[PDB]
Amino acid sequence: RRMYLVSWLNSSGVLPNSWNEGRGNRARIFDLENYIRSAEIARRGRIDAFFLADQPQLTPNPKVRPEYPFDPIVLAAAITGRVPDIGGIVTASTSFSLPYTLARQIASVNLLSGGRIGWNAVTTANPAVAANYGAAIATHDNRYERAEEFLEVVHGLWNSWKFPWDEAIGPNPNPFGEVMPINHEGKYFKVAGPLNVPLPPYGPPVVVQAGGSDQGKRLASRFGEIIYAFLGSKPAGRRFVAEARAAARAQGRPEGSTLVLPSFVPLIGSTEAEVKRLVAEYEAGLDPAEQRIEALSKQLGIDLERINVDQVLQEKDFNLPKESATPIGILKSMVDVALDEKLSLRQLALRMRLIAGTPDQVADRLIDWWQDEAADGFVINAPLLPDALEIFVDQVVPILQSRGVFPRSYTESTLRERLGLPRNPLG
């Protein structure tokens, strides 16, 4: 067993002003070489795959870099056309996609890249997205019922053309191999098939899922092979992994069917000086930390007249509001984090946003989670691309490799095999 790592690759970085950082050319998020540079950095680190989030809408907030400057399937095709080895995971919606088109486009990019592309299958709740397709958002339950049928159609399409890879030269009375339509007709979709992209011999594209709701957890137990998770408390991390594995097995899926990867933003400086400086820069890009810290203490009911912002918080210090404009589950997660990690309020305010530390501190935290099975690996969401991913790959990865928990080489050429997943995840 070893740790898996995936690197967000969108746009200029996760921080909203990131496109004015580094060399400060906002137009680099529209340049393929901007993404080649980042993917080649991840490749040098042996990162298992890059990841592209996506929503088909523009949010032209002058203070926030656009997160989705390109269609992710197109971007992942151009990247992997150029950069070998590294996998890629692309987001596309089950709400506003045609299943035959999506099946065919993910299957094409997977096959064309040598088996390196997975699909983060999401549902759409953003009404700006739905308006670009002439629709409104469906309820939570219909979203997921549609997604479930969409995933059945897509898996059916992937399996509908089994081309004879071992009999592709010379006489063959059946050179197309096994071709079988799906003749699907359900509540949401009618699709005959077959797909015109053949199943590879190493299996279908890897399917990724992200969503903590019970309906999301159900979709994941049926179709998700990688699940992205919130980096909340380590105990809630272990709980979430155990419940993911149990839900998958309960559906009859093979053991080793599911990896859980908590996602987080590293703020890595080579020393405390640099860490303290970087944290000051990040906070100077936010409303005053005196403002932010008082905001947090109210949300958690911490009385800052009796409690210093630097003292280790205790259970008795919290008075969570019964109802609030902030979901109770978030508040309770913050309490679990503060108690599990023995934090002050000032520390908690930062820890909920990002993981600041030296390379050794980050590696120690990653290894701590990974070995206690609060994670099978992690999604690294660099605050600035490529610069902060370069720091992670140059200074954290080699620690992980010395520690014996992360590979120095690409020893599998397909994503499904690199991840140790079943060749036939549904059968």
Add this chain to the structure above:
Amino acid sequence: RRMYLVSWLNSSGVLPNSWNEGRGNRARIFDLENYIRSAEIARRGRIDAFFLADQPQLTPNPKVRPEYPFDPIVLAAAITGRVPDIGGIVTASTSFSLPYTLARQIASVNLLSGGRIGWNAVTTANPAVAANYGAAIATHDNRYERAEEFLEVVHGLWNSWKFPWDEAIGPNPNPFGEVMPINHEGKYFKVAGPLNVPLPPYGPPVVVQAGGSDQGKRLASRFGEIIYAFLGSKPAGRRFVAEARAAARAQGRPEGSTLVLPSFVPLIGSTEAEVKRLVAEYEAGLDPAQRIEALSKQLVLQEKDFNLPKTPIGILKSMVDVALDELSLRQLALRMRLIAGTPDQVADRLIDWWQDEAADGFVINAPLLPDALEIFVDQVVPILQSRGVFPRSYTESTLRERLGLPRNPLG
């Protein structure tokens, strides 16, 4: 004025058994490198763009290699990520696409490649395609009604985000530039926009039209910057070109905004004798099956065999006229596609049609890829260049500027 050239790049070649020819590995059509090699051959010859045909269906006819092994947008993105300079034209259907997604994918692959990607906007008549989308084929009329609304949506979307390419570094209170929804509502589509891909400083993706019907020519007069046409005879071609330029002018488009590219299949031999050898070989080639069985459906031969269905009847009867004034079905299909000769013969025919303005350029449809395109690039292109009608270098880096089209094609 100079001649343009586009190379068809699908699968193993235009011929149905082409995946068994060459070195005979049928699985090469599923390998990115198969396409890299043909695109680099085309790039070495300064071909203006490769071209990808497409339909979203699989026909497992054991005699006919699969034409569409990959979604062409994905394939074009992969090729242009690896191969510089050469343009690319990808086919996607207005009948079974969502306009916002298609607008975004074409704009994305175009901008990612440095402006090298155009879109062949087509309709779908194949009932197997419609069945993969849970639908029945629409009437010809409705197909082009939907197409024309689709094209207006896509063009509005491409224009809906004008990022300030000149002010992307340093203080700017308006870093996104001009953003506007299209708020479109028509018969087929309701789309708000804006698109989340910005319009490039060099203009939107090139749009290609192929519809020969009367509704096809209307659509091309508004949106066709390239027209793929079947041109039977040189005078018919001259008339088609002159009519297409006039119809574009009438829609208020700039002068020099229209390119008409007929396609042909090259057959190149060193001697008249080898040309006969090769014409006989190709003659046994596409017999007897989606291209061949479709004209026998839309249609030695005699005046009694035909039953022209109640594509314009003019083209149909023009073909009946050619078969009667010479031809079998296996001889007529040959006649309709082939330009067979020595390198100098082939170059001369191409130059003849182009200097008389029967054509602005041509689509090269190689029987076997990459082999036959490699022959064309190695032996015909150099003749075209020394005659002075085809460039020796890539002097523009975007397809729009390479084709000499206007920066804002609508007006």
